């Protein structure tokens, strides 16, 4: 039972002069513009880094819920940010690190066991596993 | 310095019962909903896989434009899709594969040299380099 999900993108002409769009099969991203400027300069807009980050935060959050559930707890709220770094490395760029920042609220859990759980979610979630980048974890745990 | 791009997500409640939302720092994704139903139960909507697929397709298309540039060419059109495999492996799932498909239109390049170029981009773009999954290439080159 292999699951398939698709993303798409379009591009025209030159590297820095060119225009591009990214799409998602669910429609969430119809044909959002993106180009060399939103990736390497600073102009606000999508780029691969940001989508990957969204993907990471999304997968990790689901996973945290999952691991907690197996422990008999139910997150009331889970809020996480995934900051993706695109560093100049050698003759080019590489996505070297992804900083996971998460604020989680869960009824009754002792720090010790919760810490164990988030580590589990952090290292085992599908997206963490497929990424060869350096992944760190920062989190505040309410009550 | 180093380029930083963020992605965000929110999760409330149970794994199977809970709801999630995914965001982007650019805005392109505000608080699109996702869940164990659109991730694992074929229902239409976002999921981590599709976002990774979008990012990869986008990064690779840009890379291809770049390598065509270093060769003295300018793609008039690049249409790529990234099919992401989320496979049930062992005691869970893992993004094991990404099938890249691209329809490219470039003025006057011999099929040989161009072949050497898409291959270059396929393996060299940052996103391909960060992903530890198997990555295949399928393409059609017009003229």
From Swiss-Prot, chains A, B:
What is this protein's record name? Peroxiredoxin OsmC
Where is the stretch described as Disordered? 1-27
* Induction details: By elevated osmotic pressure in the growth medium.
**Locations listed in the record:** Cytoplasm
What family does the Swiss-Prot or TrEMBL record give for this protein?
Belongs to the OsmC/Ohr family.
Specify the enzyme's EC class, one word. Answer: oxidoreductase
**Where are the N6-acetyllysine residues found in this chain?**
16
What reaction(s) does this enzyme catalyze? a hydroperoxide + [protein]-dithiol = [protein]-disulfide + an alcohol + H2O
Q: Which NCBIfam families match?
A: osmo_induc_OsmC
InterPro entries linked: KH_dom-like_a/b, OsmC/Ohr_fam, OsmC/Ohrsf, OsmC_Ohr_Peroxiredoxin, Peroxiredoxin_OsmC
What keywords sit in the KW lines? Acetylation, Antioxidant, Cytoplasm, Oxidoreductase, Peroxidase
Question: What's the superkingdom here?
Answer: Bacteria
Q: Which residues form a coiled coil?
A: none
Give an example GO cellular component term for this record: cytosol
Q: Does the keyword Cytoplasm apply?
A: yes
Q: What are the recorded Gene Ontology BP terms?
A: hyperosmotic response; response to hydroperoxide; response to oxidative stress
Q: What does this protein do?
A: Preferentially metabolizes organic hydroperoxides over inorganic hydrogen peroxide.
- What single Pfam family name could you report for this chain, choosing any that match? OsmC
Task: Give one GO term, molecular function aspect.
Answer: protein homodimerization activity
Q: What is its EC number?
A: 1.11.1.-
């Amino acid at each position: 039972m292999t699951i398939h999900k698709k993303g798409q993108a379009h591009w025209e002409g030159d590297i820095k002069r060119g225009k591009g769009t990214v799409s998602t099969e669910s429609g969430v991203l119809n044909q959002q513009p993106y180009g060399f400027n939103t990736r390497f300069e600073g102009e606000k807009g999508t780029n691969p880094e940001e989508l990957i980050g969204a993907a990471h935060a999304a997968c990790f959050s689901m996973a945290l819920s999952l691991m907690l559930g197996e422990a008999g707890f139910t997150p009331t709220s889970i809020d996480t940010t995934a900051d993706v770094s695109l560093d100049k490395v050698d003759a080019g760029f590489a996505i070297t690190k992804i900083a996971l920042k998460s604020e989680v609220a869960v009824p009754g859990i002792d720090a010790s066991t919760f810490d164990g759980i988030i580590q589990k979610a952090k290292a085992g979630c599908p997206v963490s596993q497929v990424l060869k980048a350096e992944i760190t974890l920062d989190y505040q745990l309410k009550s």
